[PDB]
Amino acid sequence: DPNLWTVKCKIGEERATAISLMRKFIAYQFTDTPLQIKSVVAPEHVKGYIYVEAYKQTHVKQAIEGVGNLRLGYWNQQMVPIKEMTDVLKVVKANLKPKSWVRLKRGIYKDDIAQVDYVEPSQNTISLKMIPRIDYDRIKA
Amino acid sequence: ALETVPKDLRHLRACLLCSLVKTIDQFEYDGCDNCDAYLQMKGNREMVYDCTSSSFDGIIAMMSPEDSWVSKWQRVSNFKPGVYAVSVTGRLPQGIVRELKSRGVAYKSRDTAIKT
Ligand SMILES: [Zn+2]
């Protein structure tokens, strides 16, 4: 079975790296220097490095040449045991369902629990249920 | 191919049968490639929102399903290369899942993630 290798990357750039690798593979698949990589895993929970699937280290080492994003993680290629080939894909509970409970960061109701009522298909705004905390304009000037 | 690769990161959805992740423009124009005759997705947006759901996490660069343990584990070996996911949360209504079994399409839950 193929092996899974690990490569460091910048913090906050994982989907961009994935799409760039996809574009590079698609553009250099019909040439004399194809890429032998099988796939790459970029879990959402992790942030700072990405995974890659290959047999040998030389494959990925020569497949990540020229890219300016993975330059940092180019002089070292760590190998993980075979037991870690299934925990990476695990996800602990996406996270968008009506009639659920969610919390807020901005606004005034910071660090408070609230409840979803309706979701707009436009993916621009979502309703929310919360009890008001204002003073009803009796204290403030 | 260049038609399955997502164009813009923003406004991206994913299917529930084969977990095909692409852009909304590609879904509206091209639609689901791995399952089109049995889904009838091209030529409309209501069906896109009815079946596909944006509640999904994880991205994998599938390129050789015939030879890949990830493909075997996810049961996506018989699909075309593309950008798939590992967990899509959702379930089709009780109006579209019925005909898949009648037409010989086994509806399986791709939400491999655990709950609590
Ligand atoms: Zn699908």
Curated annotation (Swiss-Prot), chain A:
Assigned protein family: Belongs to the SPT5 family.
Quaternary assembly: Interacts with SUPT4H1 to form DSIF. DSIF interacts with the positive transcription elongation factor b complex (P-TEFb complex), which is composed of CDK9 and cyclin-T (CCNT1 or CCNT2). DSIF interacts with RNA polymerase II (Pol II); forms DNA and RNA clamps that stabilize Pol II elongation complex while maintaining the nontemplate DNA strand in the transcription bubble and nascent RNA in the exit channel. This interaction is reduced by phosphorylation of the C-terminal domain (CTD) of POLR2A by P-TEFb.
Location of region: Interaction with SUPT4H1: 1-93
Function: Component of the DRB sensitivity-inducing factor complex (DSIF complex), which regulates mRNA processing and transcription elongation by RNA polymerase II. DSIF positively regulates mRNA capping by stimulating the mRNA guanylyltransferase activity of RNGTT/CAP1A. DSIF also acts cooperatively with the negative elongation factor complex (NELF complex) to enhance transcriptional pausing at sites proximal to the promoter. Transcriptional pausing may facilitate the assembly of an elongation competent RNA polymerase II complex.
Tissue specificity note: Ubiquitously expressed.
Resulting phenotype, N76A: Reduces the affinity for Pol II elongation complex
Natural source organism: Homo sapiens
Protein name: Transcription elongation factor SPT5
Residues of the full protein shown: 176 to 318 of 1087
PTM text: Methylated by PRMT1/HRMT1L2 and PRMT5/SKB1. Methylation negatively regulates interaction with P-TEFb and RNA polymerase II. Phosphorylated by CDK7 and CDK9. Phosphorylation by P-TEFb (CDK9) at Thr residues of the C-terminal repeats alleviates transcriptional pausing and promotes transcription elongation. Dephosphorylated by the INTAC complex when transcripts are unfavorably configured for transcriptional elongation, leading to premature transcription termination: dephosphorylation is mediated by the PPP2CA component of the INTAC complex. Dephosphorylated by the PNUTS-PP1 complex in termination zones downstream of poly(A) sites, thereby promoting deceleration of RNA polymerase II transcription.
Cell location: Nucleus
Name of the gene this protein is made from: SUPT5H
Residues annotated as domain KOW: 96-129
UniProtKB/Swiss-Prot annotation, chain B:
SUPFAM superfamilies linked to this entry: RNA polymerase subunits (SSF63393)
Cysteine pairings via disulfide bonds: none
Binding site for Zn(2+): C15, C18, C32, C35
Record's subcellular location: Nucleus
InterPro entries hit by this protein: RPABC4/Spt4, Spt4, Spt4/RpoE2_Znf, Spt4_sf
Zinc fingers (C4-type) by residue: 15-35
Bilayer-spanning residue ranges: none
Tissue specificity annotation: Widely expressed.
The entry's keywords: Acetylation, Activator, Metal-binding, Nucleus, Repressor, Transcription, Transcription regulation, Ubl conjugation, Zinc, Zinc-finger
One Pfam family per UniProt: Spt4
Single Gene Ontology MF annotation: zinc ion binding
Residues with the N-acetylalanine modification: A1
Chain coiled-coil ranges: none
Ranges where the record places region Interaction with SUPT5H: 1-39
PTM characteristics: Ubiquitinated by UBR5 when not assembled in the DSIF complex, leading to its degradation: UBR5 recognizes and binds a degron that is not accessible when SUPT4H1 is part of the DSIF complex.
Gene Ontology cellular component terms for the protein in this record: DSIF complex; nucleoplasm; nucleus
Known role: Component of the DRB sensitivity-inducing factor complex (DSIF complex), which regulates mRNA processing and transcription elongation by RNA polymerase II. DSIF positively regulates mRNA capping by stimulating the mRNA guanylyltransferase activity of RNGTT/CAP1A. DSIF also acts cooperatively with the negative elongation factor complex (NELF complex) to enhance transcriptional pausing at sites proximal to the promoter. Transcriptional pausing may facilitate the assembly of an elongation competent RNA polymerase II complex.
Subunit and interaction comment: Interacts with SUPT5H to form DSIF. DSIF interacts with the positive transcription elongation factor b complex (P-TEFb complex), which is composed of CDK9 and cyclin-T (CCNT1 or CCNT2). DSIF interacts with RNA polymerase II (Pol II); forms DNA and RNA clamps that stabilize Pol II elongation complex while maintaining the nontemplate DNA strand in the transcription bubble and nascent RNA in the exit channel. This interaction is reduced by phosphorylation of the C-terminal domain (CTD) of POLR2A by P-TEFb.
Family in the record: Belongs to the SPT4 family.
Name of the protein described by the UniProt record: Transcription elongation factor SPT4
Organism expressing this protein natively: Homo sapiens (Human)
Gene that specifies this protein: SUPT4H1
